[PDB]
């Protein structure tokens, strides 16, 4: 409140400034006391929140008030003591449960306080952090007395941060204790970034560890999040790793015998700790000792013996399955334990995985585990048939694959016997699991995917499943009709993945075509080929059942699959289904149908130009369809060159976006990449370059960015001088596109565009000259330096990717910037030139020799402009330019 003192703070000399700043400190302390006279003032309702906000505000406005910048060691001790008084007030607030419930600003005050005491002087920061760590040590020692059965001493003053301002840290319950632990864990998570000192961090490890070993579930979660923050920086020291992994094992064991909300309150920190301690990146196992992870392995083993997947409540189960993945594929077999011990481990594992596969509602977090296991099985089978041609069967070689077959056939025969007596959603779920694992293995495990002829599940089983899902489309009473047909189309996508690895017989293929066209056939029942096709006369009724109830996402799925069929079967029918789904309102069906048609067109005919309907789709915005369209046209530029041929790539699910559908969508389409096919006079880019334009929203331009390398490697720049010149002018409009991330994206892209350019001609060089010139004029017009930075990074990119004649251009296009006075252009573009002369495999000075004539002419012109706009001033500015060029 003493505003005059708060203003004269700076004018006062420090020796008495300390007194005249203690005075407003004492007034604010009186403001605290009028609240902190009684610990139970009125209520918390969650008044004092405005008081805490005013404290934070006085602090932001007057940082020098709370601590002097001149140090003044004695006054430094005084302000330390005053901050300690404030800390005691807020800590005795945090001890009372209701008042602790006000933690939101209760952090903010001391959190920012330590921030600012660090910013002003690091020594004060270290002292205050050591004080807070002593308090935390006292707290965890109290909890150790609790867990060890000692005399607990419930009533304790615990005078920490004590002061003589002229401060009880009262504790009467485990709730008071755990709540001061809440506040401590929060402030520690906030301050962990700077308190990392390679020794103090070990103390933090120990204290958070002993807190994790015994504490309330919410305290457990907060400590679990603190431990994540710790591991994210210092890895894991071997010393606390013992207690940490012991606490981890006991927590895992408890997880089964945990209440629902008790799980929920630490679910996400637990999963974060899994992902952090077990990252996807390989070599992550080298950080931790193999006996540690071996006991972790046996722990996960006995957990799966408990059937945790069924016994637990929350599927976010996904974390433990991701941990299982970490073990299996990232960590080699034979490092933690022996390969036989790890083998029997994963044997019990996959058996429990089968038992839970029998009954599950969703399979995403389970299918990946099975894929990894069967993948390693495939690899070891390939190794033991290293060169033997040999026809091999994993239903015989893999006991796991045989058990998978047993599960599949058992669920399918239970279906056939009675679909009503079984969990139609979950039985069909498991059937889908095994089937799309098979198909994933069909396209991945097999030796043709990396001499060995594998035999997967037979096709008679597949047509048995076809008849089964037909009977389901019959026998449902259409309860939900939504989730069930979603499962059926999952089975369908599994089948079509099996076909994209190896095509089917044309009649069973037709059966599949009809299975996918059955939905909304009653929306398009009246066209030419509607009566010519043979599946309609039998689907009619079950399709009448699915007329409007069919979900639009499932429409997307089935239309995509129908497009993925070869052109030899009902080509015009695929055309018709697309045209019906061409301009429909829903975003998902539009995206899927266009992503199917970018192959369906070349399937039909005219594999040289974009269809007029796809041009209309260029015009129609539906911007999300436009970004997925930018991606699928980055694909179209190849499948319009190749003969609509897709490539069966690996595409292991290294990132699962929850429900992963349309595996063929994740599968790539290739070109034949012949010399005639690869070249293309643009003829399609005009709508593409329209999509490039700045008025088009930025994310679709970013998808175009992503596709840029592909679409230029499939584009010819040999002829059509002015047309290819306009294509390049649009490539540089992409540089003038307002978003800066798109600009640096185009820089990294032109890095490859230059080599994709078959031969750097003269006219394109002059186009670059003039376009980058006008870009620089526009940038200096805006006076915004971000434009100059994006442009100079583009110059360095094009220089590193330059031919003989372009490198002096880009070299001088940054040299003038550096010449005037620009500083960023040096440490960016000059370093790019250094990397380039490393790519030129020459000395930077010898490189200067080959371009010393343009360089010297440009230093000539810099000195000309300097001498003409203006002696000692000329000398100093010329020497500045010379030292920069130096």
């Amino acid at each position: 409140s003493m505003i005059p003192a708060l203003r004269e703070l700076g004018s006062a000399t420090p020796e008495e400034y300390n007194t005249v700043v203690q005075k407003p400190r004492q007034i604010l302390c009186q403001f605290i006391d009028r609240i902190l006279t009684d610990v139970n003032v009125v209520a918390v309702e969650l008044t004092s929140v405005m008081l805490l906000d005013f404290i934070q505000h006085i602090m932001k406005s007057s940082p020098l008030m709370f601590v002097n910048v001149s140090g003044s060691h004695e006054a430094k001790g005084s302000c330390i003591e005053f901050s300690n008084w404030i800390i005691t007030r807020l800590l005795r607030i945090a001890a009372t449960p209701s008042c602790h419930l006000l933690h939101k600003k209760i952090c903010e005050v001391i959190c920012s306080l330590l921030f600012l005491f660090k910013s002003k002087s690091p020594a004060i920061f270290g002292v205050l952090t050591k004080e807070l760590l002593q308090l935390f040590e006292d707290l965890v020692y109290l909890h150790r007395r609790n867990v060890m059965g000692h005399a607990v001493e419930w009533p304790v003053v615990m005078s920490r941060f004590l002061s003589q301002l002229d401060a009880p840290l009262q504790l009467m319950s485990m709730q008071n204790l755990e709540f001061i632990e809440v506040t401590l864990l929060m402030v520690l998570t906030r301050i962990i970034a700077i308190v990392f000192f390679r020794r103090q961090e070990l103390l933090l490890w120990q204290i958070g560890c002993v807190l994790l070993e015994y504490g309330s579930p919410k305290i457990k979660s907060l400590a679990i999040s603190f431990l994540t923050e710790l591991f994210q920086l210092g890895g894991l020291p071997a010393q606390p790793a013992s207690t940490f992994f012991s606490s981890f094992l006991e927590l895992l064991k408890h997880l089964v015998e945990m209440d629902t909300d008790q799980l929920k309150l630490y679910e996400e920190p637990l999963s974060k700790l899994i992902k952090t301690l077990f990252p996807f990146e390989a070599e992550a196992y080298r950080n931790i000792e193999p006996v540690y992870l071996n006991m972790l392995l046996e722990k996960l083993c006995v957990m799966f013996e408990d059937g945790v997947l069924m016994r637990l409540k929350s599927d976010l189960k996904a974390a433990l399955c991701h941990l299982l993945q970490y073990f299996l594929k990232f960590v080699p077999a034979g490092y933690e334990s022996a390969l036989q011990v790890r083998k029997v481990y994963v044997r019990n594992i996959c058996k429990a995985l089968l038992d839970v596969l029998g009954i599950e509602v969703d399979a995403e977090y389970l299918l990946g585990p099975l894929y990894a296991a069967l993948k390693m099985e495939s690899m070891e089978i390939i190794e033991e048939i290293q060169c033997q041609i040999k026809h091999v069967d994993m239903n015989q070689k893999s006991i796991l694959w045989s058990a998978l077959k047993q599960k599949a056939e058992s669920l399918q025969i239970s279906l056939e016997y009675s679909g009503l007596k079984n969990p139609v959603i979950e039985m069909l779920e498991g059937i889908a699991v095994v089937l799309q694992l098979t198909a994933l293995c069909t396209v991945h495990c097999s030796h043709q995917n990396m001499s060995v002829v594998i035999t997967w599940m037979s096709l008679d089983f597949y047509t048995k499943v076809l008849k089964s899902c037909r009977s389901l489309l019959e026998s449902v009473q259409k309860l939900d009709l939504e989730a069930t047909i979603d499962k059926v189309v999952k089975i369908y996508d599994a089948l079509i993945y099996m076909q994209v690895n190896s095509s089917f017989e044309d009649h069973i293929l037709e059966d599949l075509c009809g299975m996918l066209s059955l939905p909304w056939i009653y929306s398009h029942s009246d066209d030419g080929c509607l009566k010519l096709t043979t599946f309609a006369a039998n689907l009619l009724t079950l399709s009448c059942r699915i007329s409007d109830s069919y979900s639009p996402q499932a429409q997307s799925r089935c239309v995509f699959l129908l497009t993925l069929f070869p052109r030899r079967i009902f080509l015009e029918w695929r055309t018709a289904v697309y045209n019906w789904a061409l301009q429909s309102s829903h975003e998902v069906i539009r995206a899927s149908c266009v992503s199917g048609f970018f192959i369906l067109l070349q399937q039909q005919n005219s594999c040289n130009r974009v269809p007029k309907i796809l041009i209309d789709k260029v015009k129609d915005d539906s911007d999300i369809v436009k970004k997925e369209f930018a991606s699928i046209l980055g694909q179209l530029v190849c499948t319009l060159h190749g003969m609509f041929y897709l490539t069966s790539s690996l595409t292991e699910p290294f990132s699962e976006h929850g429900h992963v559908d349309l595996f063929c969508r994740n599968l790539k389409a290739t070109s034949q990449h012949e010399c005639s096919s690869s070249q293309l006079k643009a003829s399609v880019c005009k709508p593409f370059l329209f999509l490039l334009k700045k008025k088009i929203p930025s994310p679709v331009k970013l998808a175009f960015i992503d596709n840029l390398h592909h679409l230029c490697k499939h584009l010819d720049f040999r002829e059509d001088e002015t047309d290819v010149k306009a294509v390049l002018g649009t490539l540089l409009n992409l540089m003038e596109d307002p978003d800066k991330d798109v600009r640096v994206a185009f820089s990294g892209n032109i890095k490859h565009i230059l080599e994709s350019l078959d031969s750097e001609d003269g006219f394109i060089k002059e186009l670059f000259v003039l376009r980058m010139k006008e870009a620089y004029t526009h940038a200096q017009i805006s006076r915004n330096n971000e434009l100059k930075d994006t442009l100079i990074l583009t110059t360095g990119d094009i220089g590193r990717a330059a031919k003989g004649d372009l490198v002096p251009f880009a070299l001088l296009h940054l040299l003038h910037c550096l010449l005037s006075k620009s500083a960023s252009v040096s440490g960016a573009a000059y370093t790019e030139i250094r990397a380039l002369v490393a790519a030129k495999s020459v000395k930077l000075q010898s490189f200067f020799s080959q371009y010393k004539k343009p360089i010297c002419q440009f230093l000539v012109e810099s000195l000309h402009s300097s001498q003409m706009t203006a002696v000692a001033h000329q000398r100093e500015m010329a020497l500045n330019t010379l030292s920069e060029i130096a």
Binding site: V147, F196, F197, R198, E281, K773, Y776, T777, S824, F858
Partner: protein, 382 residues
Amino acid sequence: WRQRSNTQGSILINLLLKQPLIPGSSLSLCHLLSSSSSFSLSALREAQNLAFTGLNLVARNECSRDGDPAEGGRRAFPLCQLPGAVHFLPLVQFFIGLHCQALQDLSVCILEGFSVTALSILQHLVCHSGAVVSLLLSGQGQHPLLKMLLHLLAFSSAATGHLQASVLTQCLKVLVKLAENTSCDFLPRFQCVFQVLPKCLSPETPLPSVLLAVELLSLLADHDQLAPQLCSHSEGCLLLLLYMYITSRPDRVALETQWLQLEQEVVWLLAKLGVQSVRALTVMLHRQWLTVRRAGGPPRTDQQRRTVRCLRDTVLLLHGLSQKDKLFMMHCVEVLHQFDQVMPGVSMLIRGLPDVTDCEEAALDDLCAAETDVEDPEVECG
């Protein structure tokens, strides 16, 4: 909490009885007893029996139980007393004595592989007993193994080779372990071992030894008397070598992930140097900012996340030095262009991080070097 992790809280006999902790050489311990190879089977079999007895002891050792209330002291994470590894110490003492005798003369090489396996053994030992490390430090030539491992550090400081190159790494491991396992009072007696670190600070030492040395420097600077003594050197207060290692980048096979570990350890050490009270900071910020700015969003990979946090605490250290000392600005003029381009970039990038600090953010608002220019002549450009 009843088993007390006796098995983990022990020597980790599972670890002690495990395939070579070091990469290769396929050892395990009595394989060495099977290996009849302080120069005789005399006292060799004595140390072997002492080590086997100590192993049986640690197997039967339950020093800490149900929560370990006995382990007390200022040293956080006091492991346990564990008198068992004491009896294991004579074996590594004898093997490292043989190793030091094989090093002092201009011999055989297998003893050096046995030596580095013994160093890994020591690392395991000091990893799990506070009483063990306390006697290691306490016992002038006290505990001749300590003086002879210092002599090994000196022997490896020159004429590196490959075996001694590994000796550097494992000995730095065990020292930083012994250092970190010791309380503040033991740092004054750790000063004798600290006197050897300047030779490990020579521009020759490889990156793993370098980062372990920086960890040791941090552990020593946690002491209030060891930090000024270490800063009492000649070249740059013993930190000139460290800073020029940042800028020099001596190794190209060393992955920039390991370089980033080195950088984070260095900046945390210097931050501690601040709490107990430019060229290199700028060049590492240059490299890291190039790497992060080439990416258009938050680091999805963990290595680049650590890189971003390195940017965070590096600009923290930068603003700390500038507010502490105003010579920072003309210590910057020689690198002013790098600085004026990294500072705005890294500050915008950390603004891209949703979490805030308001201290590092106050640092951003304090430095905020912008636009690096006035304008460039558009005439005769490019």
